[PDB]
Every structure is written in structure tokens, then in C-alpha cells.
Design a binder for these strands. Structure first.
Lengths: 216, 217, 88, 63, 475
RNA sequence: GGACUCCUUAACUUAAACUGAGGAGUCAAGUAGGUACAAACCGUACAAGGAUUAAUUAUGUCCAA
RNA sequence: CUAAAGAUAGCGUGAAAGCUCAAAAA
RNA sequence: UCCCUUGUUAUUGAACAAGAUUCAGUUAGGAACGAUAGUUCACCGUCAGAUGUAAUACGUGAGCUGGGUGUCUGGAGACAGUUUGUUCCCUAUCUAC
RNA sequence: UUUUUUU
RNA sequence: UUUUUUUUUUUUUU
RNA sequence: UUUUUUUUUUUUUUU
């Protein structure tokens, strides 16, 4: 507010100017983007699903530069497609960054295919079987240990996401339409299905294995 | 039971690089005041209404404190209560007029005040010390108190304070239980007519319209 | 690993904020859990100097009242020593 | 009624507009002949500056 | 040393500060400001600040300086610029701009003949229309009809066609209040279009080309862009069968303009011509749609190779670089009203066309399929107090929509601005009442697993312990 | 054979309201005003006396005022 | 495809293997 | 965040059991004796109540005292008990011709 | 009764 | 942004 | 970016 600190008063805050230029995490940003840049208007043709976004995202949202939008609507072997005879949307702007937002792709994927995730199971005696029918999920965490009833999660997330298990019962697949929901569900599952670093009996998200450890 | 309460910052972004790092509300998102979906009729607020009376000499001022600041409102109220706005003001006596406040629940507070504010109540020779009550409790139990205390602490510290205080009326709700006093909020009225049409309708060929409808069908 | 400051020690560290009792910054590392840092034990703050006192703190501070009695005194200005004054 | 002057709504006028650094940067780029269509210097595009200057500076003919 | 604060701490707070630098003031305000104007050519704020300073310093600034400042402000918002229409509307909504135009109107009688083309070009650029000066400018234009050059004539015709003034419709070219109307200016652009054709016909007898500025420049100093602009201006008003009475062979003007706008160019140069592509394609599409008497003679002007090239690469850059960019206040207001009225079938910026059409050249503002209606928005200043008019761009759009068979409803800003939220909703409901739904609606909701609809989830459910030994762990 | 503060400076733990020097103000022997609450700081056209009057000062101008 | 690639900056193993970064291309 | 009881589940050279550092609450229930009198400390023996810190004028002397490295019968504050009531002691006497 | 962002 | 939230996380960069 | 400071007697931060 209106009070000088001792560091900034006496010392003058000289610490900030006492750092070394070595042992850095990342290299310095190259100062190449100097005066002499020429901007151009880029345009991209997106599927007709983005129409669900509406005007509240393309016009109401404030931005540094204008963000136009148009909808080319057309009345309705080998899939021989061309640039004519089909509907689409034109999105044009001067900033390429605005033409790469994840929301635009989500608007299409959510209403077309959705999202999915997978969990891998490992360990001796670790099996994920099925009850008579859905929704009733039970997972056995080793030999001699009682199974885990996972019906709560499925009831919570009913109609938003679904869980599938292979014949073997070593893979837990999750399929949904909601990114957030899917992720939440996956992480919820993994929270109680997490594997032990020593015995290595549990579950793990793909492309993120756990490192083994040994006692000294 | 065994952990700290869930604050308002738990349900939103944190921006240390700004004045308002996180928004604070008296209640959760899922707990905010709301209106019943079936409106039996629409209502409109009159902002403020005033009643004079020459015979009895008691004047009334009904205000609508909907989306207003507590401090400002309190400040304004103080003036009226004191009666300083009149020419014939006597500090010895209470020259003010009765004030009615509604929609107290709808008040606002800037900054991190909803989650970092408390109220102390003194105790005569108590070892525990003064009783401390959080503002969320007061909002939950009796919203009117929020304004009441601000006004009270604003009023001069004299023997007249109680008197001035008594004349103050604050309600959480829209309407008031009073009999002989107009309402700030009244049923809506029909909009006024316009002497001009801002549209230019031009129909197309019926044959082409029918052909297009058949094609679309 | 509570620390009084934060630094980027890994190749993929990210400065995040944790929803603890209070808003607290921190550093999370994926390749090494030991590098997880949480700034929650800082040094006590000092009492700052008001701004309005700045004018009378820095720079050459001249005396408030000047000295003139030593350079003002004279015999002619005193009735006890005036008669002794001689201009011839 | 005058007493309750504080409750009145007000809206001052807009003295001047506000623009972003990129918004202002694009203006000089367009003026220099680098509009959205292309490079006017490289090829004479529609609504160019040089042609407009001549035609609007010498519209009348010589007697 | 000593600090300024220290020194100041012993002096009156209201004491004035000495001046370090002093120079003589500017004796001549007009000459002082003329040199300053030379540096401001891209920043609208600089121009506005300079005008404000001059207005504060003098009550009756130089008319030439005022005209130059107005032209400078108009030039910034060019067609090739990246500025949006919202930036023009907010600029028009400023008090200083109103004061500048009022100052021009006060001494409008000091307008020179050579300053009319620049004023019209600035009007076209800023999309601002006035009934206070345009009637006077048209008088000078018509008086000096027999003295303007061909490129100026073409540019004036294009600008007036864009502004929607000078059309052939009767009793639709009058300005001023209803009780005080100015002269009728019906069929104004046709005179320029016939003058250029008459000059072209006479040029053949002389055959004296002489020196040329550039290969693309014609004998008369014309340009293919100017010829394409003339053709587009004619197409906008729909005067396809315009012909010169003096011509014994009865040759259409549009075909001649198209031929002269295409002979100089080649296939390689067409890809970089720019606006010529859009003008040619739009003119050809409109001619094909309306099928005028001169369809055969008009379609033969453009070479087949050029037509194929324009048809193939059209939906990539041509269709997107020749349309408005940015937001729109009037569009947003009606969109909010439609959303309030529970209208989820309206499509913003939607195109339409015939059944056997693979490319659309128009985009309606708010199109609804259930009711088969199109909503158009007009924001130009009306001709007078209660006599609005549709812009030239929307004039041809309405004809195309009528041909396609879609009902059109236009909303005027002058009358829409005079309403509140309640009134606007009332009027919009009344307008919609006249077009009841015909076709079924289309939804684009979220996809979900409907199969699991019968499931129920209990939150506040306590964990059961029937028996000691648990057979299964219940999370 | 003096109490606080301003500049210089001896001693001390660059400590302490200490111990002791050079030259200006105040209190001592000064009223009322400001600084939230108890001489020393700011201001004073500074208290013979009486009355229902006008002023650029330290300094203030959301409420207690 | 062309171009470029430290005697080797950060992981890893039991002596190894393996990955990534710099440079280059786009 | 104070000796024990809480934070299922990633800070650990943490296999289990038994352990070490750090942090968090809406501040919940608990923690036994003796001998020698070297003004208190390392240590010694028992029940294992299970490694058991400071401030408050030595907290506390108009409440009590002991082998040395005085007395005072409570007037006002505070604290702990208690209080019939409009009347049931007395008195309370318009207007004006 | 907020200001600034050269060409 | 979702009651996801004792030291555990997802989505979107507002 | 600025108006809002030890305003640290209380309320209030109404920008």
C-alpha cells in the first residue's frame, strides 16, 4: 500500500539482480521476432457442429482482434467428397491462435464421437470380473482379498459415461461424451485402484507406469 | 467436524496477479437465493417510495436494497435517520423519518469480505472473552443484521442512538408486514403502445414458397 | 518438502496453486516426487516505513532553525556598552 | 423526493475509444499497402491508395 | 544533495512551479495545424485529438482543414483494412464526430467542386449517410457531369450504388423532412454509366491511345477495377438492360464493361487481381439468377477459361475476404430478443439458394427454417425524420431472397432504438405471429446413453454392515 | 553547574530516556487550536476586558464531524 | 526429399541397451 | 498442531510390525508415586497413567508456612447466594356562580 | 467527470 | 468450470 | 496504468 519494506528501502531490493545465467531449466527465448512482421487473414473450414456454440462464443466474447464466423448451409461405393455439395462453417481471423482453441474441437467431438480412456491392470491374481449384468462392477485386488463394489460410481455417472471390461478382465475402458466427466470418473477409479510400488498389484493409467522399488 | 470450513475460493480460479484474486459470495453456487419458477404475475420494483403526512408529521421512506452496497446504503440511511437533510434540524431531538428496507439478502460486498469478516460481542467479566460470530452465520440466520449493525455503528454515540435505531426497519423479503404504507414492488403493467411499425414485411411468390416447402419436406 | 522459496529444479516443473486452508503456491514435479515444493513457512514480515515520511528521510537534512544571535550581537545594541563606543 | 437523489442512475458519455496494440498495428500495415487481400505494391489490388490519390486529386479535366 | 520533496515540504502546496522552457506561440493556427496533420494518417485517436484541440482553440476553424481532417478520418476505415463495422458505429456515436459534421454542415456553402469525390469516398468508407450535405454534393456532381474523368465517374457510380442513392425507382430519391423535400435525384448513376459508354464509343474514331502509365492502364486512364466496379454498381440496382439510345447497334453497357474489365487481364493475373474476381462472379451469378433479356449477350463477355477458374477456387478466399468482419450491435440486440422469446431455431449468418445450387453468394442475418423467414438489419441514417431506406448491398439481397422464395423482414435502427426491452419483445412477438411454423424443427443437443435412464443414484447413503465378515468391500 | 528536539561529534554493543561538547527554537515562566488519550512537535496579526461578525493556516472535504 | 547433428546437455542399467535435448528441416 | 488419541493413500534409505521431519481443525476426551533434604541437574528403585514446556509481580502471604545460598472486627469495585407487589406503613382536598 | 498505447 | 476437494484431481485460459 | 494513505480511534471501501 503505502509502506516501504526494509529490503526495498535499505537494501533496495538487490536480490532480484543477483541471479546467475547458468544452471537454468530452459534456454532463453530467442529474440528473433523483431520488427518486420507481416500479418495476414487466415480462414479455416470447420464441420457444421460448431453451430451449437452460438453467438455468445464468437461475438459476445471480447478479443483483441475481430473474430468473424459464417455458416454455409446446403440442402441434402467410395466416399468421394469434394469442396461443394456439403455444409460447413467458415471461421476467419488475423490471429492464428484463435483458430486453434480446444472448445471448437470439443463442440464437434462431444456431439459426434465423444472421448474415452483406459486403465491397465497388473499383478498376480488381479482380475476384474462382471456381476450378472450392469450396473454392477466388482474388481478383485489380489488373492485372498475381498472384491471392491464399484456400483456407486456407475450410478453417479449413469448416462454420462460407461465402463467396459475385456474378456480377460485386465483392462478397464471408459467411454463418454463429457470430457470432465470422463476424466473425473477415470481418476476416481484409479484413486482406489492405484497399484503398490512394492508388490505391484493394482491398476494404472496407460502411458504412465509406476517405478518399482526394493528394500535395502 | 474435523476440518476447516469450505471457503468460496474452493469453487473458482485463483489469480494472484490481480486485485480481486478470487470472488467471494455469502453462499455457494448451489445455495444462492432464487425465485420460484411459476410467477403467478410479474412484479416491478419502484426503487424508492416516499409518504408525507402533514397532520401527524411522521414521514415514511421505503427503499429497495437490491444489488446495492451495504456501506453506501448505511451511509444514506444515516442521513435520513438523523434528519440533517431538513432545514429545521435539531441535534437535541430526533428529527428524522421512518425508513423501511427490503431485499436485504441481495446485498453485495466488495473484496474478500464474505470469507474474512467476523463480528465481536462484548461480555462482562468473561474469561473466554468476547463472543465471535462469523458473517456467514448472520447471513444464514438473519440477513437484516448485516445492515443493522452497519447503521448502528454509524449513528452517533449518544443516548439518542436507541431512539434513532428503533425507527429503522429492515426485511430480507420483498414485501413488508406493515398495513398503512405503500409497497416498493408492485405488479407489472401493460407496455405503452407505439404509433409506428419498425418492420418491413414483404412476402415472396406463393408458388416459389410452396416449391421450397415441398423440396425441404 | 516445505521451503521458504520456490525454484524450478526439474525440466518440466510448473508453478501451481493449492487449495489448502489458505491460498498457497507450490511447485510440482512429474519425474521426481521429492521435488514437490510448497511455500508455507516464510520468514516473518517487518514493519514498513510510512511513505509520508519519505521527504524527511533521504537526502541532506538541513537544520530547521538557523543561527543568528552570534552574528547579531553588537555593543551599539546594548545600553550598558553603548557609551563606550567611539567613532573618532 | 429530492432528498433521495442518490438513488438516481447516471451514465456519462464516452470521451474517446480504446484500441489494442495489435489493433493499432494492423492499421498502419493496411495503410502501407498490406491489406487483407494481398500486397498492393506487388500487385495493384482493388481500392488501392495510389490510384485513389491520383483520381481524387485530379478529378477535373484541363480546359 | 537534496530531494525535490524535501524542498517542497517547506513551501505552500498551491505555489505554482516555474517554467524551464519557453518558446514563441504559433501565430497562424491554420498553418500550424496543416503541418501537424501531415504525421497523423493511421491513428484515429490522433486525428480526433487534433480536431478537438483546434476546436477548443478556435470557434470557426478553416473549412479546408475540416474537410481534410474528415477525409483523413474516413481513409483509415478503408475497404482493405481490418477494421470492423462496430468500430465505425462506435466512432459515429462520439460527440466530437457529431461536432465536426455539424461544423461542416454550418458552412456547407463553402464546398468546392474538387472536394466532392473525397467526401463521397469517405462517406462510403465510413458507411455514414447524411441528408444535410449529400443533396448539395449531388448538385455539383450533376452540374460538372461533362467535366469529370472516366475513373472518377466509375468510382462515383460505384460509391453511390453502394450508398443506395440515385436508383431508378420513382419517388425514392428525396431528402429532407416530409413538409420540406429537396429535388428528386432518380436515375443518377445511369447518367454516369451512359456518359462513360458514350465517351468509349467516340474514342474508337480517334484511335489515339498515346502514352500510357502502365500496361493495365487504358487509353482513357481507366482500370479493370473501375470497369468491374461499374458492372457491379449496375448489377446492384438491376439495370441489366441499360443501353445507349444514340447507339444504332443497341449494345448493352454491362457486356462492354465486362469485356473491357477482362481483356487486359490474364489467367495468371486473375489470381491476384483481387476484388475483380468477386465482382465478376457476383455479377454473373446475379445475371444467371434473374435471367434478364441480355443474358446471352452478358454471359458471352467473360471467357470460359476465366469462368471456370472463378467457379473452381471461390469458397476458399474470395467468399470470405469480401464480406463484413466483426460484431454487430443491431444483430446482437435482435439475437438477445430472439433468445428471450425462446427461439432456438434461428440461425445466425446462414446462407440460402436454389435447389440445384452448390455455392451460395449470400448470407442472411437470422434465418429460421421452421417458419421459413429471414431477418435483415439496417443501421444507415434514414433519409429524414421517419423516411428510412434500404442500403444498396441489402437491396440485391432482398431480390435474391425473394427469387429463392424466402420471406424477408427488415428492421430499421431508427425505429428500433426508440423502444425498451418490453416494447421490443412485444413488437418481435407481433412480427413472429404473422409467420407460423410450417416445417419441423431440428435439434443439435448433446448425445448421451439413454439406456441408463432407469438408474438412480443416492448420495446421502450410509454404509451397511449386516454381518461382521465382509464378503465384498463397498466403496 | 537543565529536561526534549534539529545539525556536527566523543563514549557505548554505530545499543539505552544514559555520560559529556559546539549553536538555533520551545518548555521552564504559554492560554485557547491541530497531532485519538499527559509540558517539549506545527501554527499564531499568540490570553486588559464585553457582545449571536468578516479572514487562506497546520490542515481537511463518504458517515460519526 | 534436402539440410544438419556437441565427444555428449538432461534420464536410464550391473558392464550394456534404450529415450530425450541441442543443431537442421518445416 | 504442546506428551497420547485424527489426516484412508505416494515426503521417506515406508516389505509387515515398531519408527523419524514437516504441515493442517469447527481447539474434542486424558495423563499415578516414593527415599535422601546438596536451594536442581545427569542418574538411581515401583505402578509402566507409557521420551510428560511457558506466561500471569515466587500468579496466589489484609488464604496458610518452613532448619537462612509483626498485626488488622471488610466502608466502595469484582466474584458466589437472595429479592411478592399496581395496592394491602403514613400522606396525596376538583370545578368556581 | 478516469488516463495511456509514435509513425 | 464440475459438492472433484483432510497433503489427491479433471476441463477450459477467463 | 491511476485515483485509496499508518484510514493503525470506529463504520465503510460504496470506484
Amino acid at each position: 500500500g503505502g509502506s516501504y519494506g526494509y529490503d526495498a528501502f535499505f537494501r533496495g531490493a538487490a536480490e532480484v539482480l543477483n541471479g546467475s545465467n547458468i544452471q537454468l531449466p530452459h534456454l532463453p527465448e530467442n529474440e528473433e521476432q523483431k520488427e518486420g512482421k507481416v500479418y495476414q487473414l487466415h480462414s479455416v473450414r470447420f464441420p457444421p457442429q460448431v453451430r451449437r456454440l452460438g453467438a455468445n462464443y464468437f461475438f459476445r466474447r471480447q478479443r483483441a482482434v475481430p473474430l468473424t464466423y459464417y455458416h454455409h448451409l446446403v440442402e441434402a461405393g467410395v466416399h468421394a467428397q469434394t469442396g461443394r455439395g456439403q455444409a460447413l462453417c467458415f471461421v476467419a481471423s488475423a490471429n492464428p491462435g484463435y483458430l486453434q482453441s480446444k472448445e471448437l474441437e470439443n463442440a464437434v467431438f462431444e456431439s459426434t464421437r465423444g472421448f474415452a480412456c483406459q486403465l491397465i491392470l497388473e499383478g498376480r491374481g488381479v482380475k476384474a470380473y462382471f456381476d450378472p449384468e450392469w450396473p454392477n462392477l466388482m474388481v478383485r485386488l489380489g488373492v485372498g482379498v475381498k472384491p471392491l463394489a464399484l456400483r456407486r460410481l456407475a450410478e453417479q455417472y449413469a448416462t454420462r459415461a460407461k465402463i467396459f471390461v475385456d474378456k480377460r478382465g485386465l483392462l478397464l475402458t471408459v467411454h463418454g461424451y463429457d470430457k470432465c466427466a470422463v476424466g473425473t470418473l477415470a481418476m476416481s477409479l484409479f484413486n482406489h485402484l492405484q497399484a503398490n510400488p512394492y508388490t505391484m498389484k493394482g491398476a494404472h493409467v496407460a502411458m504412465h507406469p509406476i517405478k518399482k522399488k526394493v528394500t535395502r | 467436524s474435523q476440518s476447516y470450513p469450505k471457503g468460496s475460493f474452493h469453487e473458482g480460479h485463483i489469480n494472484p496477479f490481480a486485485d480481486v484474486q478470487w470472488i467471494s459470495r455469502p453462499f455457494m453456487k448451489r445455495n444462492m437465493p432464487r425465485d420460484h419458477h411459476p410467477l403467478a404475475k410479474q412484479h416491478t420494483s419502484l426503487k424508492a417510495v416516499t409518504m408525507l403526512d402533514e397532520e401527524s408529521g411522521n414521514h415514511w421512506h421505503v427503499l429497495d436494497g437490491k444489488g446495492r452496497s451495504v456501506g453506501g446504503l448505511a451511509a444514506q440511511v444515516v442521513r435520513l435517520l438523523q434528519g440533517k437533510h431538513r432545514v429545521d434540524f435539531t441535534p437535541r431531538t430526533a428529527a428524522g423519518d421512518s425508513v423501511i428496507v427490503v431485499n436485504a439478502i441481495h446485498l453485495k460486498m466488495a473484496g474478500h469480505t464474505w470469507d474474512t469478516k467476523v463480528y465481536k460481542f462484548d461480555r462482562k467479566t468473561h474469561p473466554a472473552g468476547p463472543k465471535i460470530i462469523t458473517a456467514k452465520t448472520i447471513m444464514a440466520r438473519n440477513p437484516a443484521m448485516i445492515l443493522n449493525l452497519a447503521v448502528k455503528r454509524m449513528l452517533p454515540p449518544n443516548r439518542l442512538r436507541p431512539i434513532m435505531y428503533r425507527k429503522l426497519f429492515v426485511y430480507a423479503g420483498a414485501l413488508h408486514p406493515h398495513w398503512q404504507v405503500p409497497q416498493v414492488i408492485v405488479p407489472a403493467k401493460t407496455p405503452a403502445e407505439v404509433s409506428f411499425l419498425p418492420f418491413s414485411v414483404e412476402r415472396a411468390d406463393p408458388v416459389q414458397a410452396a416449391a421450397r416447402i415441398a423440396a425441404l419436406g | 518438502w516445505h521451503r521458504g522459496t520456490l525454484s524450478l529444479l526439474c525440466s518440466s516443473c510448473r508453478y501451481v496453486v493449492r487449495k489448502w486452508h489458505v491460498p498457497i503456491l507450490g511447485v510440482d514435479c512429474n519425474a521426481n516426487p521429492r521435488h514437490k515444493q510448497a511455500l508455507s513457512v516464510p520468514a516473518p514480515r517487518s514493519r514498513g516505513i510510512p511513505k509520508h515520511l519519505y521527504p524527511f528521510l533521504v537526502g541532506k537534512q538541513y537544520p530547521r532553525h538557523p543561527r543568528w544571535r552570534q552574528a547579531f550581537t553588537h555593543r551599539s545594541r546594548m545600553g550598558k556598552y553603548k557609551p563606550q563606543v567611539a567613532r573618532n | 423526493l429530492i432528498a433521495l437523489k442518490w438513488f438516481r442512475r447516471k451514465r456519462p458519455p464516452m470521451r474517446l475509444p480504446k484500441y489494442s496494440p495489435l489493433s493499432l498495428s494492423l492499421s498502419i500495415q493496411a495503410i502501407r499497402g498490406h491489406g487483407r487481400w494481398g500486397s498492393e505494391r506487388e500487385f495493384p489490388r482493388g481500392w488501392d491508395q495510389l490510384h485513389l490519390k491520383d483520381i481524387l486529386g485530379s478529378p477535373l479535366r484541363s480546359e | 544533495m537534496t530531494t525535490r520533496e524535501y524542498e517542497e515540504a517547506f513551501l505552500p502546496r498551491r505555489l505554482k512551479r516555474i517554467k524551464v522552457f519557453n518558446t514563441p506561440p504559433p501565430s497562424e493556427l491554420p498553418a500550424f495545424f496543416h503541418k501537424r496533420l501531415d504525421n497523423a494518417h493511421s491513428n484515429p485517436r490522433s486525428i480526433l485529438k487534433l480536431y478537438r484541440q483546434y476546436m477548443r482553440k478556435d470557434d470557426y476553424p478553416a473549412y479546408d482543414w475540416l474537410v481534410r481532417c474528415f477525409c483523413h478520418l474516413g481513409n483509415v476505415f478503408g475497404f482493405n483494412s481490418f477494421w470492423a463495422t462496430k468500430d465505425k458505429q462506435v466512432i459515429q456515436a462520439l460527440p466530437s464526430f457529431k461536432f465536426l459534421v455539424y461544423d461542416l454542415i454550418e458552412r456547407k456553402h463553402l464546398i468546392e467542386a474538387r472536394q466532392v469525390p473525397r467526401l463521397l469516398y469517405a462517406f462510403a468508407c465510413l458507411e455514414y449517410r447524411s441528408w444535410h450535405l449529400l443533396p448539395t454534393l449531388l448538385e455539383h456532381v450533376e452540374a460538372n457531369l461533362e467535366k469529370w474523368r472516366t475513373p472518377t465517374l466509375a468510382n462515383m457510380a460505384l460509391t453511390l450504388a453502394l450508398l443506395g442513392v440515385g436508383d431508378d425507382a420513382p419517388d425514392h430519391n428525396q431528402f429532407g423532412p416530409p413538409d420540406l423535400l429537396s429535388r428528386d435525384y432518380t436515375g443518377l448513376v445511369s447518367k454516369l454509366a451512359l456518359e462513360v459508354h458514350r465517351r468509349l464509343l467516340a474514342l474508337q474514331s480517334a484511335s489515339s491511345s498515346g502514352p500510357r502509365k502502365s500496361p493495365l492502364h487504358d487509353s482513357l486512364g481507366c482500370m479493370p477495377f473501375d470497369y468491374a466496379g461499374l458492372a457491379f454498381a449496375l448489377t446492384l440496382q438491376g439495370s441489366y438492360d441499360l443501353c445507349l439510345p444514340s447507339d444504332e447497334t443497341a449494345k448493352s453497357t454491362l457486356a462492354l464493361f465486362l469485356q473491357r474489365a477482362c481483356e487486359p487481364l490474364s489467367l495468371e493475373q486473375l489470381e491476384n487481381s483481387g476484388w475483380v474476381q468477386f465482382f465478376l462472379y457476383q455479377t454473373l451469378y446475379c445475371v444467371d439468377v434473374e435471367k434478364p433479356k441480355r443474358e446471352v449477350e452478358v454471359k458471352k463477355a467473360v471467357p470460359f477459361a476465366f469462368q471456370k477458374h472463378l467457379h473452381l477456387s471461390w469458397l476458399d478466399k474470395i467468399l470470405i475476404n469480401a464480406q463484413p468482419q466483426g460484431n454487430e450491435l443491431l444483430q446482437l440486440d435482435v439475437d438477445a430478443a430472439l433468445k428471450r422469446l425462446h427461439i432456438t431455431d434461428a440461425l445466425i449468418n446462414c446462407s440460402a439458394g436454389r435447389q440445384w445450387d452448390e455455392q451460395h453468394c449470400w448470407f442472411a442475418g437470422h434465418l429460421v427454417r421452421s417458419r421459413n423467414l429471414a431477418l435483415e438489419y439496417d443501421y444507415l441514417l434514414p433519409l429524414g425524420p421517419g423516411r428510412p431506406k434500404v442500403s444498396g448491398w441489402l437491396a440485391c439481397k432482398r431480390r435474391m431472397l425473394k427469387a429463392f422464395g424466402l420471406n424477408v423482414a427488415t428492421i430499421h435502427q431508427s425505429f428500433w432504438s426508440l423502444l425498451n426491452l418490453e416494447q421490443k419483445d412485444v413488437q418481435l412477438t407481433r412480427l413472429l405471429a404473422q409467420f407460423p411454423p410450417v416445417l419441423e424443427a431440428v435439434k443439435d443437443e448433446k448425445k448421451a446413453y439413454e439406456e441408463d435412464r432407469h438408474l438412480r443414484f443416492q448420495r446421502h447413503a450410509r454404509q451397511k454392515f449386516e454381518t461382521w465378515p465382509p464378503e465384498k468391500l463397498e466403496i
